[PDB]
């Protein structure tokens, strides 16, 4: 076979240990899901880190720790029919625990807004670094991709679908490792779900075609991410969303001539329109990905333990430094004297 005796047994035992890890992780997740604060005047607002909600660097007054505070307008959330999504975001972040998932520290609400206070990740978005450099070499892209594979193996084992993978939502921490943010489309899904949501370039065809789809849309999105990391642009690329959708549904992917054949093979199996053939959706599960030739040099345990030397370490100029983030227009945080949408957000 491909593996000799020692290799074959080592890998089998490795896969059994993964099962054991995941079983324990599910116990811990369910316990927190079952038995899950602060207030605005506990923080100084420093700078806006991102908009879409709105995320601000804040400083906790008593401790001086810095955090990233997501601010959501309750009225905007209702109008856009994102109530359930926003409750999913908080509850899921409250309950998960994984080295590449951003940690939620506090959450609270006032008359006008919801707040989610997360760990501040000072290295900036992968998006910025990718657009600045152009493309990542295959080993660099593989380092990040391996962390996403492990994160999705973890989330999917908990029956959690993520649904918004993209470089904008991946932050680089002080050690050069990834922190996944933005759980607004994350959902507990045993099987199928139907909401049309995501980001156009990263949508699987079954979403665009209004099918009841499953967690394999995350594996398609992984293929988009790996392609974009290694090419500098995504595989289905157009100025307007409708044009993007038409390309996705055709599925005819073309690759840069510098892509290795191992990479192209992996991507053809992730960017697979036929769900009976898509890696991550087959009998062998995530192991079709983890055991692919493109990942043959990846020590999955060492990645999980953060013991692999990172390809890139952000310059860190001190606590509270925002030099790795773009500038945004700064707006007041206005809090009405009248409570809005109290019934909608009672569980928040």
């Amino acid at each position: 076979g491909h593996m000799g005796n020692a290799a074959a047994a080592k890998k089998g035992s490795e896969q059994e240990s993964v099962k054991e890890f995941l079983a324990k992780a599910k116990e811990e997740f369910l316990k927190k899901w079952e038995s899950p604060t602060a207030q605005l005047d506990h923080f100084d607002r420093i700078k806006t880190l991102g908009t879409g909600g709105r995320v601000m660097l804040v400083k906790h007054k008593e401790t001086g720790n810095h955090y990233a505070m997501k601010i959501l307008d309750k009225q905007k959330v209702v109008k856009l029919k994102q109530i359930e999504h926003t409750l999913n975001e908080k509850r899921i972040l409250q309950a998960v625990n994984f080295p590449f998932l951003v940690k939620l520290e506090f959450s609270f609400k006032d008359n006008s807004n919801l707040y989610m206070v997360m760990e501040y990740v000072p290295g900036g978005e992968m998006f910025s670094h990718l657009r600045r450099i152009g493309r990542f070499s295959e080993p660099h892209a593989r380092f990040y991709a391996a962390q996403i594979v492990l994160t999705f193996e973890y989330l999917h084992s908990l029956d959690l679908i993520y649904r918004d993978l993209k470089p904008e939502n991946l932050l680089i921490d002080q050690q050069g490792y990834i922190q996944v943010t933005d759980f607004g489309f994350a959902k507990r899904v045993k099987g199928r779900t139907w909401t049309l949501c995501g980001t156009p370039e990263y949508l699987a065809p079954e979403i665009i075609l209004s099918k009841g789809y499953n967690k394999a849309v995350d594996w398609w999105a992984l293929g988009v991410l790996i392609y974009e990391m290694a090419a500098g642009y995504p595989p289905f690329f157009a100025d307007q969303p409708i044009q993007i959708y038409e390309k996705i549904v055709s599925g005819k992917v073309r690759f840069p001539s510098h892509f290795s054949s191992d990479l192209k093979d992996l991507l053809r199996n992730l960017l697979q329109v036929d769900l009976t053939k898509r890696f991550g959706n087959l009998k062998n599960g995530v192991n079709d990905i983890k055991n692919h030739k493109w990942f043959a040099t990846t020590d999955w345990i060492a990645i999980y333990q953060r013991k692999v030397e990172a390809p890139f370490i952000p310059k860190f100029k001190g606590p509270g430094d925002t030099s790795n983030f773009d500038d945004y227009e700064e707006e007041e945080i206005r809090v009405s004297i009248n409570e809005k949408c109290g019934k909608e957000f009672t569980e928040f």
Binding site: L80, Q82, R131, E168, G184, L196, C197, G198, A238, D239
Partner: peptide, 13 residues
């Protein structure tokens, strides 16, 4: 030609 800036999520079609 395609979108090089940050890409917003969509909530419907």
């Amino acid at each position: 030609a395609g979108r090089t800036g940050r890409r917003q999520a969509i909530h419907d079609i």
